[PDB]
Design a protein around this nucleic acid. Structure first.
Length: 49
DNA sequence: GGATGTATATATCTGACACGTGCCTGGAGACTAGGAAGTAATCCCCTTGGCGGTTAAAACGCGGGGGACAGCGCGTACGTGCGTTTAAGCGGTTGCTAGAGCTGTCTACGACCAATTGAGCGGCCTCGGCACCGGGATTCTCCAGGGCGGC
């Protein structure tokens, strides 16, 4: 029953344990030097199931 | 009618300008060597913007009492003024010596350059001491047998 539409992150925060199941689109506003940080950022929403 | 106040003219004093001279120090011209600017490479420290977790320091609030400050009294010690003394200030004597300045001579001492080598910096191997692991000696807790009591 969430009225939230957009969820903002700093890219390197939260660790690997953030579940962001309900979201669908990921906007990388600023790219990282390390591509694994952006891969983890995309995998916040691209989880199993 | 006599003497006093005031204006203009002339001689003298004094700071400033220019002339003269020495001399010595700064400027002009030429040559040379090296100090510093520039270049390339390598490596380590600093910058900016973040994240995560610990934790002790910082912040905030509140009660209370110690200390800052104000007021008052008092007595003493310092200011003030005057008369007296005294020593500072100035001018002066009289010689000798210290010291600045200048000139002159010379000699020992320090700059400079080439060759050498031995003391300073870095790494490597070893010892002194501290620590990890295995074995022997000493002391503590426990399980079972013997004897006694009850129905």
């Amino acid at each position: 029953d969430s009225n939230d539409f957009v969820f903002l992150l700093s890219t390197r925060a939260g660790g690997l344990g953030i579940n962001l199941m309900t979201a669908d689109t990921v906007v990388i506003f600023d790219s990282d030097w390390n591509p694994q940080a952006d891969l983890q950022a995309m995998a916040r929403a691209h989880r199993i199931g």
